[PDB]
Tab-separated table of N, CA, C and O in Angstrom:
chain	number	residue	atom	x	y	z
A	53	UNK	N	19.314	8.188	62.905
A	53	UNK	CA	18.165	7.655	63.656
A	53	UNK	C	17.030	7.194	62.762
A	53	UNK	O	16.483	6.105	62.977
A	54	UNK	N	16.654	7.990	61.764
A	54	UNK	CA	15.555	7.669	60.866
A	54	UNK	C	16.041	7.783	59.426
A	54	UNK	O	17.140	8.273	59.151
A	55	UNK	N	15.205	7.325	58.495
A	55	UNK	CA	15.530	7.357	57.077
A	55	UNK	C	14.247	7.579	56.285
A	55	UNK	O	13.157	7.701	56.850
A	56	UNK	N	14.385	7.633	54.963
A	56	UNK	CA	13.252	7.837	54.077
A	56	UNK	C	12.561	6.507	53.785
A	56	UNK	O	12.972	5.444	54.255
A	57	UNK	N	11.493	6.567	52.995
A	57	UNK	CA	10.699	5.398	52.646
A	57	UNK	C	10.561	5.312	51.130
A	57	UNK	O	11.032	6.182	50.391
A	58	UNK	N	9.909	4.247	50.670
A	58	UNK	CA	9.660	4.017	49.250
A	58	UNK	C	8.203	3.598	49.098
A	58	UNK	O	7.830	2.488	49.488
A	59	UNK	N	7.387	4.483	48.533
A	59	UNK	CA	5.957	4.247	48.409
A	59	UNK	C	5.642	3.519	47.107
A	59	UNK	O	6.248	3.793	46.066
A	60	UNK	N	4.691	2.592	47.176
A	60	UNK	CA	4.241	1.822	46.023
A	60	UNK	C	2.750	2.070	45.851
A	60	UNK	O	1.955	1.746	46.743
A	61	UNK	N	2.371	2.638	44.709
A	61	UNK	CA	0.988	2.992	44.422
A	61	UNK	C	0.404	2.015	43.410
A	61	UNK	O	1.026	1.736	42.380
A	62	UNK	N	-0.786	1.502	43.709
A	62	UNK	CA	-1.507	0.594	42.824
A	62	UNK	C	-2.889	1.180	42.567
A	62	UNK	O	-3.584	1.584	43.507
A	63	UNK	N	-3.281	1.238	41.295
A	63	UNK	CA	-4.556	1.821	40.894
A	63	UNK	C	-5.539	0.791	40.358
A	63	UNK	O	-6.684	0.733	40.816
A	64	UNK	N	-5.123	-0.028	39.395
A	64	UNK	CA	-6.016	-0.983	38.758
A	64	UNK	C	-5.296	-2.308	38.563
A	64	UNK	O	-4.076	-2.353	38.384
A	65	UNK	N	-6.071	-3.392	38.603
A	65	UNK	CA	-5.558	-4.749	38.409
A	65	UNK	C	-6.399	-5.365	37.293
A	65	UNK	O	-7.478	-5.915	37.538
A	66	UNK	N	-5.913	-5.274	36.061
A	66	UNK	CA	-6.637	-5.758	34.896
A	66	UNK	C	-6.135	-7.136	34.480
A	66	UNK	O	-5.022	-7.548	34.812
A	67	UNK	N	-6.983	-7.849	33.738
A	67	UNK	CA	-6.654	-9.178	33.229
A	67	UNK	C	-6.228	-9.040	31.769
A	67	UNK	O	-7.007	-9.252	30.838
A	68	UNK	N	-4.966	-8.681	31.579
A	68	UNK	CA	-4.386	-8.516	30.255
A	68	UNK	C	-3.643	-9.785	29.845
A	68	UNK	O	-3.487	-10.727	30.625
A	69	UNK	N	-3.185	-9.800	28.598
A	69	UNK	CA	-2.429	-10.919	28.060
A	69	UNK	C	-1.043	-10.450	27.637
A	69	UNK	O	-0.750	-9.253	27.586
A	70	UNK	N	-0.183	-11.419	27.334
A	70	UNK	CA	1.184	-11.137	26.917
A	70	UNK	C	1.200	-10.767	25.435
A	70	UNK	O	0.161	-10.532	24.812
A	71	UNK	N	2.394	-10.704	24.850
A	71	UNK	CA	2.572	-10.389	23.433
A	71	UNK	C	3.378	-11.520	22.800
A	71	UNK	O	4.610	-11.518	22.855
A	72	UNK	N	2.679	-12.487	22.201
A	72	UNK	CA	3.366	-13.602	21.559
A	72	UNK	C	4.066	-13.156	20.280
A	72	UNK	O	5.196	-13.576	20.004
A	73	UNK	N	3.414	-12.307	19.490
A	73	UNK	CA	3.995	-11.806	18.252
A	73	UNK	C	3.316	-10.488	17.901
A	73	UNK	O	2.279	-10.131	18.461
A	74	UNK	N	3.922	-9.769	16.958
A	74	UNK	CA	3.406	-8.483	16.511
A	74	UNK	C	3.598	-8.360	15.009
A	74	UNK	O	4.696	-8.608	14.499
A	75	UNK	N	2.536	-7.979	14.307
A	75	UNK	CA	2.586	-7.807	12.863
A	75	UNK	C	1.445	-6.893	12.441
A	75	UNK	O	0.584	-6.526	13.247
A	76	UNK	N	1.448	-6.527	11.162
A	76	UNK	CA	0.438	-5.648	10.590
A	76	UNK	C	-0.008	-6.214	9.250
A	76	UNK	O	0.828	-6.491	8.382
A	77	UNK	N	-1.316	-6.385	9.084
A	77	UNK	CA	-1.897	-6.920	7.859
A	77	UNK	C	-2.613	-5.777	7.142
A	77	UNK	O	-3.635	-5.274	7.635
A	78	UNK	N	-2.112	-5.317	6.001
A	78	UNK	CA	-2.791	-4.245	5.268
A	78	UNK	C	-3.902	-4.783	4.380
A	78	UNK	O	-3.981	-5.976	4.079
A	79	UNK	N	-4.771	-3.869	3.959
A	79	UNK	CA	-5.846	-4.212	3.040
A	79	UNK	C	-5.303	-4.326	1.622
A	79	UNK	O	-4.449	-3.541	1.201
A	80	UNK	N	-5.805	-5.312	0.882
A	80	UNK	CA	-5.350	-5.577	-0.473
A	80	UNK	C	-6.542	-5.634	-1.417
A	80	UNK	O	-7.685	-5.846	-1.003
A	81	UNK	N	-6.256	-5.441	-2.706
A	81	UNK	CA	-7.279	-5.498	-3.741
A	81	UNK	C	-6.874	-6.482	-4.832
A	81	UNK	O	-5.887	-7.208	-4.683
A	82	UNK	N	-7.628	-6.516	-5.928
A	82	UNK	CA	-7.358	-7.413	-7.047
A	82	UNK	C	-7.051	-6.575	-8.280
A	82	UNK	O	-7.925	-5.862	-8.787
A	83	UNK	N	-5.813	-6.664	-8.762
A	83	UNK	CA	-5.372	-5.948	-9.952
A	83	UNK	C	-4.589	-6.906	-10.837
A	83	UNK	O	-3.741	-7.656	-10.343
A	84	UNK	N	-4.871	-6.878	-12.137
A	84	UNK	CA	-4.216	-7.777	-13.075
A	84	UNK	C	-4.301	-7.192	-14.475
A	84	UNK	O	-5.174	-6.373	-14.775
A	85	UNK	N	-3.378	-7.627	-15.329
A	85	UNK	CA	-3.352	-7.208	-16.722
A	85	UNK	C	-2.765	-8.337	-17.558
A	85	UNK	O	-2.159	-9.276	-17.035
A	86	UNK	N	-2.951	-8.237	-18.873
A	86	UNK	CA	-2.486	-9.253	-19.804
A	86	UNK	C	-2.031	-8.577	-21.091
A	86	UNK	O	-2.104	-7.353	-21.238
A	87	UNK	N	-1.557	-9.390	-22.032
A	87	UNK	CA	-1.086	-8.901	-23.324
A	87	UNK	C	-1.348	-9.978	-24.367
A	87	UNK	O	-1.118	-11.168	-24.126
A	88	UNK	N	-1.846	-9.558	-25.528
A	88	UNK	CA	-2.145	-10.456	-26.636
A	88	UNK	C	-1.117	-10.225	-27.735
A	88	UNK	O	-0.999	-9.109	-28.254
A	89	UNK	N	-0.381	-11.275	-28.089
A	89	UNK	CA	0.656	-11.208	-29.106
A	89	UNK	C	0.460	-12.348	-30.099
A	89	UNK	O	-0.422	-13.198	-29.943
A	90	UNK	N	1.297	-12.362	-31.135
A	90	UNK	CA	1.291	-13.406	-32.145
A	90	UNK	C	2.637	-14.115	-32.151
A	90	UNK	O	3.656	-13.548	-31.747
A	91	UNK	N	2.630	-15.370	-32.603
A	91	UNK	CA	3.846	-16.173	-32.630
A	91	UNK	C	4.892	-15.555	-33.549
A	91	UNK	O	5.939	-15.091	-33.083
A	92	UNK	N	4.617	-15.552	-34.856
A	92	UNK	CA	5.391	-14.809	-35.850
A	92	UNK	C	6.859	-15.225	-35.912
A	92	UNK	O	7.638	-14.640	-36.674
A	93	UNK	N	7.251	-16.233	-35.143
A	93	UNK	CA	8.647	-16.647	-35.038
A	93	UNK	C	8.681	-18.025	-34.388
A	93	UNK	O	7.647	-18.690	-34.249
A	94	UNK	N	9.876	-18.466	-34.000
A	94	UNK	CA	10.027	-19.738	-33.323
A	94	UNK	C	9.953	-19.622	-31.816
A	94	UNK	O	10.382	-20.524	-31.093
A	95	UNK	N	9.406	-18.506	-31.328
A	95	UNK	CA	9.295	-18.269	-29.894
A	95	UNK	C	8.032	-18.865	-29.293
A	95	UNK	O	8.028	-19.224	-28.109
A	96	UNK	N	6.962	-18.986	-30.077
A	96	UNK	CA	5.704	-19.526	-29.577
A	96	UNK	C	5.250	-20.694	-30.441
A	96	UNK	O	4.086	-20.758	-30.854
A	97	UNK	N	6.171	-21.616	-30.733
A	97	UNK	CA	5.851	-22.749	-31.596
A	97	UNK	C	4.772	-23.632	-30.977
A	97	UNK	O	3.669	-23.763	-31.520
A	98	UNK	N	5.072	-24.246	-29.832
A	98	UNK	CA	4.132	-25.146	-29.173
A	98	UNK	C	3.698	-24.623	-27.810
A	98	UNK	O	2.498	-24.454	-27.574
A	99	UNK	N	4.640	-24.356	-26.904
A	99	UNK	CA	4.303	-23.894	-25.578
A	99	UNK	C	5.091	-22.650	-25.214
A	99	UNK	O	6.136	-22.354	-25.795
A	100	UNK	N	4.562	-21.917	-24.225
A	100	UNK	CA	5.215	-20.674	-23.815
A	100	UNK	C	6.481	-20.945	-23.007
A	100	UNK	O	7.563	-20.483	-23.413
A	101	UNK	N	6.440	-21.664	-21.884
A	101	UNK	CA	7.683	-21.996	-21.189
A	101	UNK	C	8.252	-23.309	-21.694
A	101	UNK	O	7.573	-24.348	-21.650
A	102	UNK	N	9.493	-23.308	-22.195
A	102	UNK	CA	10.083	-24.562	-22.692
A	102	UNK	C	10.173	-25.639	-21.623
A	102	UNK	O	9.564	-26.704	-21.768
A	103	UNK	N	10.914	-25.383	-20.548
A	103	UNK	CA	10.929	-26.329	-19.438
A	103	UNK	C	10.620	-25.693	-18.090
A	103	UNK	O	9.826	-26.247	-17.326
B	307	UNK	N	7.596	-8.223	-46.465
B	307	UNK	CA	7.020	-7.710	-45.232
B	307	UNK	C	8.073	-7.664	-44.132
B	307	UNK	O	8.847	-8.608	-43.950
B	308	UNK	N	8.100	-6.551	-43.398
B	308	UNK	CA	9.078	-6.384	-42.329
B	308	UNK	C	8.706	-7.275	-41.149
B	308	UNK	O	7.533	-7.624	-40.941
B	309	UNK	N	9.714	-7.663	-40.373
B	309	UNK	CA	9.535	-8.564	-39.237
B	309	UNK	C	9.110	-7.744	-38.025
B	309	UNK	O	9.939	-7.110	-37.366
B	310	UNK	N	7.812	-7.759	-37.725
B	310	UNK	CA	7.272	-7.056	-36.568
B	310	UNK	C	5.907	-7.639	-36.247
B	310	UNK	O	5.233	-8.156	-37.147
B	311	UNK	N	5.471	-7.582	-34.984
B	311	UNK	CA	4.139	-8.105	-34.642
B	311	UNK	C	2.993	-7.228	-35.115
B	311	UNK	O	1.833	-7.639	-34.984
B	312	UNK	N	3.269	-6.046	-35.653
B	312	UNK	CA	2.231	-5.160	-36.134
B	312	UNK	C	1.871	-4.086	-35.127
B	312	UNK	O	2.567	-3.844	-34.137
B	313	UNK	N	0.747	-3.430	-35.400
B	313	UNK	CA	0.265	-2.373	-34.525
B	313	UNK	C	-0.292	-2.957	-33.231
B	313	UNK	O	-0.781	-4.089	-33.193
B	314	UNK	N	-0.213	-2.168	-32.163
B	314	UNK	CA	-0.660	-2.577	-30.837
B	314	UNK	C	-1.794	-1.659	-30.402
B	314	UNK	O	-1.683	-0.432	-30.508
B	315	UNK	N	-2.885	-2.254	-29.926
B	315	UNK	CA	-4.030	-1.522	-29.399
B	315	UNK	C	-4.186	-1.884	-27.929
B	315	UNK	O	-4.120	-3.063	-27.563
B	316	UNK	N	-4.376	-0.871	-27.087
B	316	UNK	CA	-4.471	-1.048	-25.643
B	316	UNK	C	-5.890	-0.726	-25.196
B	316	UNK	O	-6.484	0.268	-25.636
B	317	UNK	N	-6.440	-1.578	-24.335
B	317	UNK	CA	-7.763	-1.377	-23.754
B	317	UNK	C	-7.585	-0.900	-22.317
B	317	UNK	O	-7.183	-1.677	-21.443
B	318	UNK	N	-7.883	0.372	-22.075
B	318	UNK	CA	-7.720	0.991	-20.764
B	318	UNK	C	-9.073	1.502	-20.291
B	318	UNK	O	-9.664	2.381	-20.928
B	319	UNK	N	-9.558	0.952	-19.181
B	319	UNK	CA	-10.848	1.350	-18.656
B	319	UNK	C	-12.027	0.908	-19.492
B	319	UNK	O	-13.040	1.613	-19.546
B	320	UNK	N	-11.923	-0.247	-20.150
B	320	UNK	CA	-12.997	-0.764	-20.970
B	320	UNK	C	-13.059	-0.217	-22.379
B	320	UNK	O	-13.780	-0.783	-23.212
B	321	UNK	N	-12.336	0.857	-22.679
B	321	UNK	CA	-12.333	1.454	-24.007
B	321	UNK	C	-11.030	1.129	-24.726
B	321	UNK	O	-9.948	1.195	-24.133
B	322	UNK	N	-11.141	0.778	-26.004
B	322	UNK	CA	-9.980	0.476	-26.830
B	322	UNK	C	-9.506	1.754	-27.515
B	322	UNK	O	-10.282	2.417	-28.212
B	323	UNK	N	-8.240	2.101	-27.303
B	323	UNK	CA	-7.651	3.321	-27.842
B	323	UNK	C	-6.446	2.943	-28.693
B	323	UNK	O	-5.712	2.005	-28.364
B	324	UNK	N	-6.252	3.672	-29.793
B	324	UNK	CA	-5.113	3.472	-30.679
B	324	UNK	C	-4.111	4.597	-30.455
B	324	UNK	O	-4.258	5.678	-31.045
B	325	UNK	N	-3.090	4.404	-29.625
B	325	UNK	CA	-2.156	5.497	-29.330
B	325	UNK	C	-1.218	5.760	-30.499
B	325	UNK	O	-1.189	5.040	-31.498
B	326	UNK	N	-0.437	6.830	-30.353
B	326	UNK	CA	0.581	7.181	-31.335
B	326	UNK	C	1.912	6.502	-31.029
B	326	UNK	O	2.565	5.974	-31.933
B	327	UNK	N	2.324	6.512	-29.764
B	327	UNK	CA	3.540	5.844	-29.328
B	327	UNK	C	3.276	5.135	-28.007
B	327	UNK	O	2.494	5.607	-27.177
B	328	UNK	N	3.937	3.997	-27.821
B	328	UNK	CA	3.773	3.176	-26.627
B	328	UNK	C	5.147	2.803	-26.095
B	328	UNK	O	5.959	2.220	-26.822
B	329	UNK	N	5.406	3.135	-24.834
B	329	UNK	CA	6.690	2.827	-24.233
B	329	UNK	C	6.633	2.973	-22.731
B	329	UNK	O	5.703	3.565	-22.174
B	330	UNK	N	7.655	2.423	-22.080
B	330	UNK	CA	7.793	2.467	-20.629
B	330	UNK	C	9.131	3.106	-20.290
B	330	UNK	O	10.187	2.557	-20.627
B	331	UNK	N	9.086	4.257	-19.625
B	331	UNK	CA	10.294	4.985	-19.262
B	331	UNK	C	10.074	5.659	-17.913
B	331	UNK	O	9.023	5.510	-17.283
B	332	UNK	N	11.080	6.406	-17.474
B	332	UNK	CA	11.028	7.145	-16.221
B	332	UNK	C	10.656	8.601	-16.479
B	332	UNK	O	10.733	9.100	-17.604
B	333	UNK	N	10.250	9.282	-15.408
B	333	UNK	CA	9.824	10.668	-15.507
B	333	UNK	C	9.939	11.321	-14.136
B	333	UNK	O	9.577	10.716	-13.124
B	334	UNK	N	10.446	12.552	-14.115
B	334	UNK	CA	10.585	13.298	-12.873
B	334	UNK	C	9.223	13.800	-12.412
B	334	UNK	O	8.472	14.390	-13.195
B	335	UNK	N	8.906	13.567	-11.142
B	335	UNK	CA	7.633	13.990	-10.574
B	335	UNK	C	7.842	14.335	-9.105
B	335	UNK	O	8.933	14.170	-8.555
B	336	UNK	N	6.778	14.816	-8.472
B	336	UNK	CA	6.789	15.186	-7.063
B	336	UNK	C	5.846	14.282	-6.280
B	336	UNK	O	5.126	13.449	-6.839
B	337	UNK	N	5.855	14.460	-4.960
B	337	UNK	CA	5.033	13.669	-4.058
B	337	UNK	C	4.238	14.594	-3.146
B	337	UNK	O	4.543	15.783	-3.010
B	338	UNK	N	3.210	14.030	-2.520
B	338	UNK	CA	2.367	14.784	-1.602
B	338	UNK	C	3.006	14.808	-0.219
B	338	UNK	O	3.464	13.775	0.279
B	339	UNK	N	3.035	15.985	0.398
B	339	UNK	CA	3.656	16.182	1.705
B	339	UNK	C	2.596	16.739	2.646
B	339	UNK	O	2.141	17.877	2.478
B	340	UNK	N	2.202	15.939	3.636
B	340	UNK	CA	1.249	16.361	4.656
B	340	UNK	C	1.987	16.559	5.973
B	340	UNK	O	2.359	15.572	6.625
B	341	UNK	N	2.304	17.794	6.353
B	341	UNK	CA	2.898	18.059	7.670
B	341	UNK	C	1.846	18.446	8.699
B	341	UNK	O	1.678	19.642	8.984
B	342	UNK	N	1.108	17.486	9.270
B	342	UNK	CA	0.054	17.876	10.228
B	342	UNK	C	0.605	18.598	11.447
B	342	UNK	O	0.107	19.672	11.809
B	343	UNK	N	1.623	18.025	12.091
B	343	UNK	CA	2.340	18.658	13.200
B	343	UNK	C	1.401	18.974	14.367
B	343	UNK	O	1.236	20.125	14.776
B	344	UNK	N	0.790	17.914	14.903
B	344	UNK	CA	-0.065	17.998	16.088
B	344	UNK	C	-1.188	19.018	15.890
B	344	UNK	O	-1.247	20.057	16.552
B	345	UNK	N	-2.078	18.705	14.944
B	345	UNK	CA	-3.210	19.583	14.662
B	345	UNK	C	-4.051	19.818	15.912
B	345	UNK	O	-4.325	20.964	16.285
B	346	UNK	N	-4.475	18.739	16.571
B	346	UNK	CA	-5.262	18.812	17.802
B	346	UNK	C	-4.532	17.993	18.867
B	346	UNK	O	-4.815	16.806	19.050
B	347	UNK	N	-3.594	18.631	19.563
B	347	UNK	CA	-2.840	17.954	20.600
B	347	UNK	C	-3.661	17.647	21.835
B	347	UNK	O	-3.948	16.480	22.123
B	348	UNK	N	-4.051	18.687	22.570
B	348	UNK	CA	-4.864	18.517	23.772
B	348	UNK	C	-5.478	19.859	24.134
B	348	UNK	O	-4.748	20.825	24.377
B	349	UNK	N	-6.807	19.918	24.175
B	349	UNK	CA	-7.513	21.136	24.564
B	349	UNK	C	-8.940	20.769	24.928
B	349	UNK	O	-9.668	20.222	24.093
B	350	UNK	N	-9.340	21.067	26.164
B	350	UNK	CA	-10.687	20.750	26.627
B	350	UNK	C	-10.985	21.553	27.884
B	350	UNK	O	-10.185	21.559	28.823
B	351	UNK	N	-12.127	22.235	27.890
B	351	UNK	CA	-12.582	22.945	29.067
B	351	UNK	C	-13.843	22.340	29.645
B	351	UNK	O	-14.919	22.452	29.049
B	352	UNK	N	-13.729	21.696	30.806
B	352	UNK	CA	-14.853	21.012	31.427
B	352	UNK	C	-14.802	21.235	32.933
B	352	UNK	O	-13.937	21.947	33.451
B	353	UNK	N	-15.747	20.615	33.639
B	353	UNK	CA	-15.822	20.713	35.088
B	353	UNK	C	-16.493	19.460	35.632
B	353	UNK	O	-17.103	18.687	34.889
B	354	UNK	N	-16.370	19.267	36.942
B	354	UNK	CA	-16.925	18.108	37.622
B	354	UNK	C	-17.870	18.554	38.729
B	354	UNK	O	-17.623	19.562	39.399
B	355	UNK	N	-18.950	17.798	38.916
B	355	UNK	CA	-19.924	18.074	39.960
B	355	UNK	C	-20.391	16.757	40.561
B	355	UNK	O	-20.249	15.689	39.962
B	356	UNK	N	-20.956	16.844	41.764
B	356	UNK	CA	-21.423	15.682	42.502
B	356	UNK	C	-22.934	15.749	42.680
B	356	UNK	O	-23.498	16.828	42.887
B	357	UNK	N	-23.583	14.587	42.593
B	357	UNK	CA	-25.023	14.485	42.793
B	357	UNK	C	-25.280	13.507	43.933
B	357	UNK	O	-24.340	12.951	44.511
């Protein structure tokens, strides 16, 4: 004769957006080092990279 | 004269130091382990009143 029901509860209706993409950008700094050498051979005749 | 670039001096932290030996190798070490394990999960004692 009768049956159960299915209740639908609504609390808030906000104006949200979708998710086009997701990523994480970390904080970065500036770090660098160098080295001073002498030619002393045929390795540093004219330029450092040959081609 | 032997074939070598000579002695090497390294400037670390603005100061020039003359080390005894200079090389790059591996070394066994440990890491920091922070097991917080829900330090402050949920705890609050409050009440509600009407005006």
